[PDB]
Every structure is written in structure tokens, then in C-alpha cells.
Amino acid sequence: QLEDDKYSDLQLVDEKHTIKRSVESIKSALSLVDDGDLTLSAYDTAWVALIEDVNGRSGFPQFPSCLQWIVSQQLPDGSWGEPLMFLAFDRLLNTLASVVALTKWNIRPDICQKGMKYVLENLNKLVDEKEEHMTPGFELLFPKLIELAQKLDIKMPMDSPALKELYARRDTKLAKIPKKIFHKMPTILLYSLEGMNDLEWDKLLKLKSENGSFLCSPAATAFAFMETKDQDCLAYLTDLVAKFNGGVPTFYPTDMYEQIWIVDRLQRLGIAHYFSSEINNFVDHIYRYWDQKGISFARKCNLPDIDDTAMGFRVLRTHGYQVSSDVFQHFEKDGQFYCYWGQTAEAVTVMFNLYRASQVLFPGEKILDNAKKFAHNFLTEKVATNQVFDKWIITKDILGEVQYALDVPWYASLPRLEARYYLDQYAGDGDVWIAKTLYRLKYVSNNEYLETAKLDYNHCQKIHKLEWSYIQKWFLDLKIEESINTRTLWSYYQAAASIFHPERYNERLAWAKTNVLVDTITTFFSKQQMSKDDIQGFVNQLTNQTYGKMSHMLIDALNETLKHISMKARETHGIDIYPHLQSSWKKWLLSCMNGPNVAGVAELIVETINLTSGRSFSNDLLSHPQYKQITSITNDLCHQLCSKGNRAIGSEIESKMQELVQLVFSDSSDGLDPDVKKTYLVVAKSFYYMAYFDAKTIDSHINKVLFEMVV
């Protein structure tokens, strides 16, 4: 029912301006991205506030602004912590630390007492909390706070069942510490250094990160300074205390983690094309500080992790930067993958992100093939066992995200399909991550991305629905013998779900009509039992014998379509493409003489897209050696796919797609233009998609992508 007021042109115009305004808003907010924008932590701020004046000014703290920040942040119930997501351990850590800091420096006894009232009242309720919910290191960090409080004469209930139980778990964890390794190399243990004893600072001080911190943790670095007076540790804290007006987060910097996840989310939400300038800058930064040993959450932290590594790897490769899969060997041992030494990569989202990285593999990258099998099995079982949850991330629909990954390989993840599902899963402001304490990444998880992405999608969807009506009319006006069948909608959807942008209507519509006519021509060849000689005559009429009234009507219908396509393409660029389209169809039609009729369809579609877009003339494809190469791989690939039948997609097809991926994303300065290259992958995926899913699933995809507005 496109007679409504919402499909009117004036309404569509206002939506575009509204979308453009939101895009400019995001763009200005993204211009402020620097070293990381994280939740500030009262726990870490309190630890920094404990530092005594370094020039001997007895009775005064070194960082008074930290104490003032703490004062300003107390919640109405007397606690400190994440205001909107309540977590008992988060509140207890942030609150007792704040009380201890303020007590040490004799500040606001009224605030201290409200704070202690909350701690003492919620201490006993730790009994009612199971083991798997206690935040990382709590059994080490909270007892340490109790120790500091007792020495300030804050009396605690040490006979409480809750604390007797807590201190028991502290004792076992401390007994499990591998002291030698912990003192020999950077480990995740340094991030919780303040909760440990049995320290040989002679060796630990060799493990400082490049910015002078211990694992980029202000609390651990403040603890280290008070134990050792290390001047590098003090410099890290001084710079940090000046950047956020006293309040500090639970780790800093976080530039790699933040900028990588920005690119990922914008890409998955389907609006990354609006931020190519900003995304190119982010990816540039990621590549500049890429390391063959892996990357951390900060370029200046000395502990790489598999999650940052797997996400930066995938983002860098799909952006065209050369990166070796050998990096993952630093996170693999005896057939198992690890976040870092001592911590298996047992988290769902980490395995989710690893599975995603493994699928961009090139031929011969066995470690990525091992990772794919490993992660796919891990995730499939957590889905079957009804366990798709991460104890250390509060998100909206982690199950849906994992389900989509297992149901839709990357080779079959059409752009609009990926976005359509993620738009219902992305949490916006609601994503709360769990480290020592709860924190939020505003540049990664916010409601403005989601709202803008939903508006853009439903807007493109309105354009698609209008184009679909136009395609139905164009086909019927070519009254030859056929009707609007299911295959006609598939032919448009295949184009619209990949090249979806409203401004790219010429490419999308030309591809859609080409699918339709390829379907019609090949069906005609079959029904009429046309020989090679018959097809030969069919070609001569197209360009300049030929018999059969229906033959002449198909040739004219083809030529009229090509004339119309090139007509509309004049608005994009000025070069007349009709001769080149005729040549491309001549080449395909002649290929139907010598072999299967799907042998060169992919080349025909790709050339049509490159011509209507104008990329065939922006770059001299001509005899660039990669042109013949990518054309042959793609034709062979889509030959294997469309003519696989009822076989399953086997190893040979997977390997050929890997060949294409390697060519497409191995950008060189003198290589074929990347945008031209990526078109071949776009079409190949659309062939893979059609061979991977059954009819009923395709239909369900079509309804959701094209006809279900995003709520």
C-alpha cells in the first residue's frame, strides 16, 4: 500500500535531513575520541587519594582533587558505584574504598558514616550470593579494604559468616598464585596487585607498562607507589588525575579497545558508511600500534589479550591492512585458546569475537581454521546446553548475537541481514561491562547510535519497498510470457540486501534486472531446447540468422532494459555504458554456447555494477593482471555454488572463497582498486547465501529485511 503519506516524497526528504542531522551529531561526538572515555571509579579514585603528600606535608593528600570527586559522587543510600546497574560487589568495593580514603584525611564524617552504614548493612547479605556472581578479584580486593579500614579504627564484624567465608576464599586464591611466573612476566594478576602479598618489588618493578603503570590500573599503580615510591608510577597517576578532574576509571588508557569496538558496532549497525572519515582515522591508529605479539586494550599496556587481538585483526584485514594470523599463536596452547596466560578464553563473547575473526582467514592459515572449529563447537554447545551467557557482561541479547553467528556464516551474511538482526540486539546505553568494577563505554554503547541506525534502516527499507513495486511494474511492462514469481522477489532482494544505499539505486536496480533477465533467458534456452547454433543466432540479433518471434521479443526486451539502465546511469556519471553492457551480455551469452549457462553470470553481474557505478572508468581495469585473476576465481566460485545442486558446500568451495577473500583484502598500492575488488566479494557472497539457505529460510529473511520495519 504505497499510496500512504509515509511513502510520499516530501516525507522521505524530511527523513533524510533528520538522519543527516543525527549523523553530524555523531560525527562531532566522535571528533572528541582520544585515549578513552570510561565510567569513573570511586574504588580507583579512593586508592589514588590514599597517597600521602610526597614533599612531607604531613596531614595532606598528594591528590586532593580525588577526595573532592569522591565527596561529590555519593548516592542517596550512602553507597558509591554504577548508579543504574546495581551489583552488590560493585557497591561494596566502591563504597568502602571511598570511606577509607575520606576517613584517612578526616573529610566529611557525615558522609563516612552514611557510607559505613551501607557497608555494614550489606556485608551480611554476601552469604545469599552464590560463588559465580562475585566480581573478579573481590575475594582479594575487598579484604584489603577491610584491612585498611581496621587500621583507621573502623570496626568491622570479623566474626560475621559473610566475612569468615570471604576470607576463606581469599586464602585459597592467594595459595594458588604462581609466584615465580607472576614475578617473571606481565600477567593479568598485576591488574589486581593491590590485593596481594608476598611481593618481590625488585622483580615486579621490571613489569611496569610503558606509561609507568601496572597494567594501566590506577589502584594497582597507586598501591605500588605507596609500597615503593616509584617515580614512573607517580607520573602515570599525576597525568591521570589532571585529565578527569580527580576521578579516575578502573583502567586507563583504553584507546585500542575503544576505537576497535567503535568500528565494530558502527559496522554491525549498518551505518558505518556515514563515518568513513572517522573510521579510517580509527583504523589508522589501530594499525600504527599493531604488534605481532598481539595488542592490549591500550597501546601503552604491556599485556596483550586475545579479544583485542581478534577484533583488531578482523577490523584491520577487512579494511585492507596486511596482518599475519601468526599473532594468534601467542594465545594458543595445546589446542586451547587463552585470553592471556592463566586464563582460558572461556567467555562467550570472547569466543564469539574469535569465531568472527577466524572466518576472514586466507588459504593456508591453519591456526584460524583451528580457531573456527574450536570456537564454533564451544558456541554451539553453549547454545544447545542453554548456557549462552557471560558472567561478566550485562547485555541485551547475547544469545541472539551468538545465534546469528552460528546460523549465518560470514560468507552468507548479507549487509542488510546482519544489520536487521543486530538492530534488535544492540543494547545502546544498557551495555555494562564488568572488570574490577562496573563500567560503561559511551562511544561503543549508546542510544544515539541505535536510534540513528534504526531510522536509517527503516528509511532505506521504505526506498526498497518503493523500488520493489517499480521492479514488478517494469517486468510486467516487458510482457513476454511470464508473471511476478517468487524468483522475481529473490532477484531484487539479492541486490537490495547487499547494495542497499538509497544513493546507489542505479547499481542495485541494474543488478536486480540482470538477475531477472538471466533467469528469463536461461529458462528460455532450456524450454526451447536451443542448440549452440541457436544461441549463436540469438547473439547476432542483440548486436546486429535469428528466428522465432519470442526470440526477437526477448532480445528487444533485453536491449530496452540496457538502454534504460545506461540512461539512468547518466545521472551518476557522464560516460555512456550501453556499448559496454551489450558487450558484457554478448560475452555471457557466448559462454552459454561452450558450457554451463551459470559459468559467467557472476562476471556479468559484477561488470554491470562496476559500469553503472562508473568504477570501470575511474580505474583502468583493462589488463591489470588482478582483473583476469579475480574474474576467473569469481566465475569459478559462482559456477561451483549455483551448480552444486543438493550437495553441501564442501571444502573446495570454502577454499575458493578464501582465495577470493585473500585477493580482495590484500590491498597493494599498485593493486586493483579495492572498491572494484570488493564488488566481486559482494556478488560471491550473494551466491553463497542462496546456496546455503533453503527456500523457507530465504523467504523469512526477505520478509524481515524488506517488509518488517525495525521497532
Residue numbers in the entry: 19 to 562, 567 to 733
Can you quote the paper on this entry?
The first committed reaction in grindelic acid biosynthesis is the transformation of the core diterpenoid precursor geranylgeranyl diphosphate (GGPP) into the bicyclic intermediate 7,13-copalyl diphosphate (7,13-CPP) catalyzed by the class II diterpene synthase (diTPS) Grindelia robusta TPS2 (GrTPS2). GrTPS2 is mechanistically closely related to other class II diTPS enzymes that facilitate the protonation-dependent cyclization of GGPP to form a range of CPP intermediates via a common labda-13-en-8-yl+ diphosphate intermediate. All class II diTPS share a common three-domain (γβα) fold with the active site being formed by the N-terminal γ and β domains. A conserved catalytic DxDD motif controls the general acid-base mechanism to bring about the cyclization of GGPP with the middle Asp residue functioning as the general acid.
The GrTPS2 crystal structure adopts the conserved three-domain fold of class II diterpene synthases featuring a functional active site in the γβ-domain and a vestigial ɑ-domain. The N-terminal segment (residues 1–18) and a short region of the J-K loop in the α-domain (residues 563–566) are disordered in the GrTPS2 structure. AtCPS E211, predicted to be involved in substrate binding and the catalytic DIDD motif, including D325 as the general acid functioning in substrate protonation, is conserved in GrTPS2 (E157) and situated at the bottom of the active site cavity. By contrast, a His-Asn dyad, previously shown to be important for catalytic specificity in AtCPS and other ent-CPP synthases, is replaced with Tyr (Y209) and Thr (T268) residues located at the top of the active site. The respective GrTPS2 residues, namely D449, R286, R283, and D282, are conserved in GrTPS2 and coordinate several water molecules. The presence of a solvent channel in GrTPS2 is shown to connect the catalytic DIDD motif with bulk solvent similar to AtCPS.
